[PDB]
Paper text:
A core issue is that hemagglutinin (HA), the major viral spike protein and seasonal vaccine immunogen, preferentially elicits antibodies against its hypervariable regions, limiting coverage and compromising pandemic preparedness. In rarer cases, intergroup protective bnAbs can be generated by human antibody paratopes that accommodate the conserved glycan differences between the group 1 and group 2 stems. Differences between the glycosylation positions on the group 1 vs group 2 stem also impose steric constraints that hinder intergroup-reactivity to bnAb supersites.
Cross-group protection depended on the presence of the human bnAb precursors within the B cell repertoire, and the vaccine-expanded antibodies enriched for a N55T substitution in the CDRH2 loop, a hallmark of the bnAb class. Structurally, this single mutation introduced a flexible fulcrum to accommodate glycosylation differences and could alone enable cross-group protection. In the mature antibodies, contact to the group 1 stem is greatly strengthened by S32R in CDRL1.
Numbering used by the authors:
A (entry chain F): 1 to 230
B (entry chain E): 1 to 216
C (entry chain D): 1 to 108
D (entry chain B): 8 to 103
E (entry chain B): 258 to 326, 333 to 499
F (entry chain A): 361 to 412
G (entry chain C): 413 to 463
Amino acid sequence: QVQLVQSAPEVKRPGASVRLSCKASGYTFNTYGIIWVRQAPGQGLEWMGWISAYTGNTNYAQKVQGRVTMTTDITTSTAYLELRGLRSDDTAVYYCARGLLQGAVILDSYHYALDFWGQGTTVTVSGASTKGPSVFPLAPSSKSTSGGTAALGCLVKDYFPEPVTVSWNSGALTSGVHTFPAVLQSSGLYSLSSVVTVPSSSLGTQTYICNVNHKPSNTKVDKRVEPKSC
Amino acid sequence: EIVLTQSPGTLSLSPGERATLSCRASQSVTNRFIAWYQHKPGQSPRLLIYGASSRATGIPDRFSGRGSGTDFTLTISRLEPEDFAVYYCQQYDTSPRWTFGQGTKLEIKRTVAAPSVFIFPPSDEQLKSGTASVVCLLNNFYPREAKVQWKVDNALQSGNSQESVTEQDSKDSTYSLSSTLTLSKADYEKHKVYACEVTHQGLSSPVTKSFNRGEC
Amino acid sequence: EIVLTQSPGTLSLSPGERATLSCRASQSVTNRFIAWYQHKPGQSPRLLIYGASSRATGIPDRFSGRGSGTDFTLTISRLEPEDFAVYYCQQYDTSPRWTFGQGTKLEI
Amino acid sequence: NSTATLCLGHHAVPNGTIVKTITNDQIEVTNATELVQSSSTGEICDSPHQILDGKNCTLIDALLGDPQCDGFQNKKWDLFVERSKAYSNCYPYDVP
Amino acid sequence: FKIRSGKSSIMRSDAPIGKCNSECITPNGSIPNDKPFQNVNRITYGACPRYVKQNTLKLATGMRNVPEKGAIAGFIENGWEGMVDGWYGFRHQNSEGRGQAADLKSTQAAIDQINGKLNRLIGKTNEKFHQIEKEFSEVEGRIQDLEKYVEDTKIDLWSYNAELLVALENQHTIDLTDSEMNKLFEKTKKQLRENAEDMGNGCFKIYHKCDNACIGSIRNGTYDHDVYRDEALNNR
Amino acid sequence: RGQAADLKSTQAAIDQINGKLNRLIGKTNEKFHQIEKEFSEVEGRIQDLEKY
Amino acid sequence: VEDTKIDLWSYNAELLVALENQHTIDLTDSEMNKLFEKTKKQLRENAEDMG
Ligand SMILES: *[C@@H]1O[C@H](CO)[C@@H](O[C@@H]2O[C@H](CO)[C@@H](O[C@@H]3O[C@H](CO[C@H]4O[C@H](CO)[C@@H](O)[C@H](O)[C@@H]4O)[C@@H](O)[C@H](O[C@H]4O[C@H](CO)[C@@H](O)[C@H](O)[C@@H]4O)[C@@H]3O)[C@H](O)[C@H]2NC(C)=O)[C@H](O)[C@H]1NC(C)=O
Ligand SMILES: *[C@@H]1O[C@H](CO)[C@@H](O[C@@H]2O[C@H](CO)[C@@H](O[C@@H]3O[C@H](CO[C@H]4O[C@H](CO)[C@@H](O)[C@H](O)[C@@H]4O)[C@@H](O)[C@H](O[C@H]4O[C@H](CO)[C@@H](O)[C@H](O)[C@@H]4O)[C@@H]3O)[C@H](O)[C@H]2NC(C)=O)[C@H](O)[C@H]1NC(C)=O
Ligand SMILES: *[C@@H]1O[C@H](CO)[C@@H](O[C@@H]2O[C@H](CO)[C@@H](O[C@@H]3O[C@H](CO[C@H]4O[C@H](CO)[C@@H](O)[C@H](O)[C@@H]4O)[C@@H](O)[C@H](O[C@H]4O[C@H](CO)[C@@H](O)[C@H](O)[C@@H]4O)[C@@H]3O)[C@H](O)[C@H]2NC(C)=O)[C@H](O)[C@H]1NC(C)=O
Ligand SMILES: *[C@@H]1O[C@H](CO)[C@@H](O[C@@H]2O[C@H](CO)[C@@H](O[C@@H]3O[C@H](CO)[C@@H](O)[C@H](O[C@H]4O[C@H](CO)[C@@H](O)[C@H](O)[C@@H]4O)[C@@H]3O)[C@H](O)[C@H]2NC(C)=O)[C@H](O)[C@H]1NC(C)=O
Ligand SMILES: *[C@@H]1O[C@H](CO)[C@@H](O[C@@H]2O[C@H](CO)[C@@H](O)[C@H](O)[C@H]2NC(C)=O)[C@H](O)[C@H]1NC(C)=O
Ligand SMILES: *[C@@H]1O[C@H](CO)[C@@H](O)[C@H](O)[C@H]1NC(C)=O
C-alpha cells in the first residue's frame, strides 16, 4: 500500500545543521510532491516547505526561507530536508505528508490535500550534555495517607534528552500507574514524576521498586520505595 | 496570509452526541481547498475530510464536512471512543502554501470527580545534593481545570513551581496533575511548614495538604 | 456527423395548396448556414434558399424559407406544376462539410 | 557521420475531443472537461437541508388545520415539498 | 403563529425523498454542486450551479491534438502520439540511435496554469435560498409578465456570460500550451548557438559529434558551446 | 559598468496603460429613482420580486 | 428591470466588440510574423535580416 517511512530521532547542538529523510513506497514517487509540516511542543502544526518529484521547484515558509534546503532523489523515492542554524524553537516533531499531484490536471481535491503521513521524527536542539537520570523516592505518607488508598512514587530528575521508560516492579504493577509528561527545567534538563496508588494494607506486604531506563545515557537505575519510619 | 481561526478551542461532550467544529477564514476561499485533519496524541496526523465535504477513503460516514466562503464546519455524529482527538483545518495558496489551524481539542466524557490530593516531602538524599523538590499530586480528577497554590509558612510562593498533567485515562476518563516546587536546601531549612492548596469544581471547600519540616 | 432529418418523406398536396417542409438539425446551427435545394428528376439541382430565409436570384417569390435553431422550414404558397420535385436540406461548418438531407418528395 | 539531430515535439492522443475557441468553431483538444450538469439522481436527498414532505397537504392547508395535516402541526422545515396530489377535505376556503 | 425572517422556502415537485447528502435541490432531484453551470430546472434551493440554456460547454484541459505521419519530426506541424511520460519532449537520432525523452518542467508549468484556471471555475458555489416562482398554474396578467421577464432576461444574460467565459478560457489554454513549446525551442536554440540550425521542421539540425551524453547535456542544461566549438567547420 | 534606460519603449507601455485606465476610471451612472431594499415589514409577492 | 437589462447587455456587447477587435488585429499581425520566420528558415545561412 501507499506508505511513507521517515528518518530516525535526532539530537543536535544549537547552530548545527540537521538532515531528515522521507521515503515513499507503493505509489509512483514522481507524480506527487512531499510536504513537510512540524509540530513544536504545545503548538499547532506548522507548514515548512514543499518539494516536487516531477520538477525541482521548492517553496519555503517565510520564517525559514534562508535556513531551509530541500532535495529529492528519484532513486529511491527519498526526500531530504536540511535545516541549518538550528535554534531552540526548532525543537519539534517533523512530519512528511504526500502532496499535490504534479503529473496531470487536477479535479479531485484529494491530491490538493495531504493524505498519507509518515510517523514523524523528533528533533531536540539544546546545548545540554547528555546526562543520566537521578532517581529520588516519593515516600508513602504517614497516617496511611488515606483510609484505604496509599500513594507512592519516584521522581526522575535532571535527565537529557528524552525519552525515559519507567516500569514498576518489573511490569508486575500496571494498575493505577501514572507517568506524567516531562517538563523542561530552567537548567535545560528534563524532569519527570511517576506515581502509583496501592492499598494501604499492602504497604507492608509488598515491596515497591521503580525501574528507570535512559537509553541515550545507557543508564538504568532501580530505586526501592518504602515508607520512612522514625 | 490567510489566517484560519478555529471555534470552540476546547469542546466537552458525552459519548453519543453530535459535535460541530468551526473554522473561520480571514478571506473568502473556494470550497476546493480547506480540508480537515485529525491528530491523535502520540500518533501521526490523519486526513478525515478532503476538499470541503468529500469523505476520505476509510473514514467512517459519521464524519461529515460542510461550508462555504468564510465559514466551514465539521460535524460528527454517534460519537465513539475512537473519535476523541485534536482537529485541524487547512487550505492552499496558488504558490504551494498551507496555513493550518490553531487546534480544537475534543476532551470529552463527563462525571465531575473530586481530586485525591497527596503531598510528598523531599528525600534526604536529594537534600544532600543541594536541591529540594516538594511534590503535590492530584489523582483521578475531572474536569481538567484545577488550581494549586503553594504555601510556605503561610506565605504564598510564585514563580518557583512547575506543573504537569496526564492525558485522559482510558479506563475512567480522568486526569492527574503534579506540581513540583524547586528550592535550595538552605531555603528549605529556613521554613518549617509546607503546604499545597487545591481548588477544584468537585471540592466545595479548597483542600490543603501540608507537612512540617523534620517531622514525619 | 451532424445529421439533418427531413419531414415528411413524401407529401401529397393538390395544386394550389400551401406546402410546409420541416428539417430538424441534430445540433443548433447559426442561420448563416442551412440552405434549401430543389432537384427535379433528370436535371441538375437548383438552389432555392440560401442563408436561412433569403431567396436566390431568379427564384419565384412563393418559396419562403424560415426557421431557427434546430428546426428550419420551407413554405411554398400556391403550388404550381413546375414545383413537383425532391427538396434537400443542407448545412455547412467551419471545416468545409456540406451534410445533405434524405429528401422530401412532393407527390402532388 | 558526425552530425546528429534533435527534434522538439509535443504529445497527441488517438482519441480527440472538440472545443470552441474565440475564432474557430471546432478545434481539437486532448482532454476536455464538461462545465454543465445535465442530469439528476432522481431522488431529493434529505441531508443536509431539513425537508418536510407535504404528502397530501398544501402549506396553507397545514396552516389552517385541515385534519389530514394533523401530523404536520407545530413543525419546523427548511424546504416544504408540496405535492401535485394535494387535496383538501374541509369547508370551501378562498384566500385573497 | 410565529413569523421569523428566515431562509426556509417551498418547492413544488413530485420527486421521491431518499436518504443521501446533497447541497443543491431541484424539483427533478438533487444535482451535484461542483459544475459551475446546469441545465436541469430553473428552480433551485441551496448552493446550486447557475442555470444556463446550453446543454454541454466544453472547457479544454489539454493542448491541440495534432496527429503524426526513418526520420523524425518536430512541433512545426507534427505531434508524437507515443509520448506518454510528459506533454513536451525531445527526440533524437544520434550515432548510437534514435531515442525519446520528455521535458518534465515545461509540462508541469503548463499543467499548473490549467489547474489554476480550473480551480477558479469549478470550485465556486452560489448560495440562494428563497426566490420568485417561475411556474404559474393560472393566468394572472400583470405580475406574471414581469417576473417571467425577470427570469428569462437573467437566464439569457448568464448564458451569454458562460459562453464568453468558456471560449475565452479555451483560447487562452491553446495559446499557452503552444507558447510553452515555442519557449522550449528558443531556449534550445540559445544553448546550441553556433552548433545548430533550424531544419524548417521542429528538428534542430546540429552538426557536432553527439553521443547519448550530448543529448542528455542539452536537456539538463550543460551543453557548452566552447567544448564542441571546433566543429564550427560546418560552413567549410 | 553603467545603466541607461530606453525611454521610448517605457513610454509606449505607459501610454497603453494610460489609455486603458482612462477608459475605466471615467464612469458615471446617472440613475436617480429605483426600488428599495429596506423593508420594515413583510409583504409577499412584490417583496420577493423586488429583492430578486 | 428594463434599465438594468439594457445596461448589462450593452456592457456585454462593448466587451465583446473590444476583445474581438483585439483578436483580429493580433491574428493578422501574427500571420505576417510567422511568414517572416518561415522565410528565414528557408533561406538558412544565405542571407541575414537587413533590419
Ligand atoms: C481530464 O480532465 C478531467 C476534468 O478535470 C479530470 O477529471 C477527473 O479525474 C478523475 C481521475 O483522478 C476522475 O474522478 C473520479 O470520478 C469518479 C466518478 O465516476 C465517474 O467517472 C468514472 C471514470 O473515472 C466513470 O467510470 C463513472 O461512470 C463516472 O462517470 C469517482 O468515483 C472517483 O472518486 C474516487 O474513486 C476511487 C474509489 O476507489 C478512488 O480510487 C479514486 O482515486 C477517486 O478518488 C473520482 O472522483 C474523473 O473520471 C475525471 N473526470 C472526467 C470528466 O474525466 C481528469 O483527471 C483528466 N484526465 C487527464 C488524463 O488529463
Ligand atoms: C473516444 O472514445 C471515447 C469513449 O471512451 C468517446 O468519448 C466520449 O465522447 C462523447 C462526445 O464528446 C462524450 O459524450 C457526451 O457529449 C454530450 C454532448 O456531445 C455529443 O455527444 C454525442 C456523441 O457525439 C452526440 O451524439 C450528441 O448529439 C452530442 O452532440 C454531453 O451531453 C456529455 O456530458 C454529460 O453527459 C451526461 C448526460 O447528461 C451527464 O450525466 C454527464 O455528467 C455530462 O454532464 C458528454 O460530454 C463522452 O463524455 C466521451 N466519453 C469519454 C469517456 O471520454 C469519444 O467519442 C471517442 N473519440 C473519438 C474521436 O473516437
Ligand atoms: C393521501 O392520499 C392517498 C390517496 O387518496 C390516500 O390513500 C388512500 O387511502 C384510502 C384509505 O385506506 C384508500 O381507500 C381504500 O380504497 C380501496 C379501493 O381503492 C382501489 O381503487 C382505487 C381507484 O378507484 C385505487 O386508487 C386504489 O389504489 C385501490 O386499488 C378499498 O378497497 C379500501 O377498503 C379497505 O377497507 C375496507 C374496510 O371495510 C375493507 O373491507 C377492504 O377490503 C379494504 O381493506 C379503502 O376504502 C385509497 O384507495 C387510498 N388511495 C391510494 C391512491 O392509495 C392516503 O391515505 C392519504 N394520506 C396519506 C397520509 O398518505
Ligand atoms: C426536469 O423537469 C423539467 C420541468 O418539468 C423538464 O422540462 C420540461 O420537459 C417537458 C418535456 O420535454 C417540456 O415539455 C415540452 O415542451 C415543448 C415545447 O412546447 C414541446 O415541443 C414538447 O412536446 C413533445 O412531445 C410532442 C408529442 O407530439 C412532440 O411532437 C415534440 O417534438 C416534443 O417531443 C413538450 O411538450 C417542458 O417544456 C420542459 N420545461 C418545463 C418548464 O416544464 C425536464 O425535462 C426535466 N428533466 C431534466 C433532465 O431537466
Ligand atoms: C546531464 O546529462 C548527462 C548525460 O550523459 C549526465 O552525464 C554526464 O555527461 C557528461 C558529458 O560531458 C560527463 O562529462 C559526465 O561525467 C556525466 N556524468 C555522469 C554522472 O554520468 C550529466 O551528469 C547531467 N548533468 C546534470 C547536472 O544533471
Ligand atoms: C444545446 O442544444 C441546443 C439545441 O437543442 C442549442 O440551443 C445549444 O446551443 C446547445 N448547446 C451547446 C451546443 O453547447
